[PDB]
Design a binder for this molecule. Structure first.
Ligand SMILES: CCOP(=O)(O)OP(=O)(O)OC[C@H]1O[C@@H](n2cnc3c(N)ncnc32)[C@H](O)[C@@H]1O
Length: 171
């Protein structure tokens, strides 16, 4: 388990790889894969849709059952459900939807949930459908997370941009 390979070490606890999070999860077998979730755990597109699709929709059914007895998550909040065939556990974390004016400071709260887990395979929270700048999401991850986070960025051009601007800013 947690056999991560081919990552660029950004800090003592943050790693980044140009990879699709589903394919990484199948290779690595992480204890925790992170979902970029929304408060009702409707796994439509992006990471959530890809993770759910790779579980043959088991993640959505599990999530419906969770919501039915617990109600929606809060923005910046999280829950631990099954990792299905992809991981031991999936940490569903709700970043703020910046497009709808949700407070971008909640991205800090979202990444704080990573600190409850020794090691995680994760995407850049809020950087896709939710409209936060990916460079900002990476910065918040680096400053907030103290546990071992392995970031999967599937798009090569975004990966190159993220690494370049991480170096520039780091000084
Ligand atoms: C409703 C929640 O909205 P939120 O913005 O929080 O999450 P998202 O829309 O899933 O995007 C989060 C970030 O992961 C990237 N991304 C998308 N698919 C994959 C994938 N298969 N593997 C690795 N990275 C991926 C996406 O391009 C964006 O950089």
């Amino acid at each position: 388990v947690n056999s991560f390979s081919g990552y660029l070490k950004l800090t003592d606890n943050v790693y980044i790889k140009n990879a699709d999070i589903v394919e990484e999860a199948k290779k690595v077998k992480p204890t925790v894969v992170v979902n970029a979730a929304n408060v009702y755990l409707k796994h439509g597109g992006g990471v959530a849709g890809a993770l759910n699709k790779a579980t043959n929709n088991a993640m959505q059914v599990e999530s419906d059952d969770y919501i039915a007895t617990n109600g929606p998550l809060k923005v910046g909040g999280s829950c631990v459900l099954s990792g299905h065939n992809l991981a031991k556990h999936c940490l569903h974390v709700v970043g703020p939807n910046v497009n709808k004016g949700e407070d971008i400071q909640l991205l800090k709260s979202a990444y704080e949930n990573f600190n409850q887990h020794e090691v995680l395979l994760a995407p850049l929270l809020s950087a896709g459908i939710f409209g936060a700048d990916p460079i900002h999401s990476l910065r918040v991850c680096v400053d907030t997370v103290r546990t071992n986070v392995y970031l999967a960025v599937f798009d090569k051009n975004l990966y190159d941009k993220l690494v370049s601007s991480f170096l520039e800013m780091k000084s």
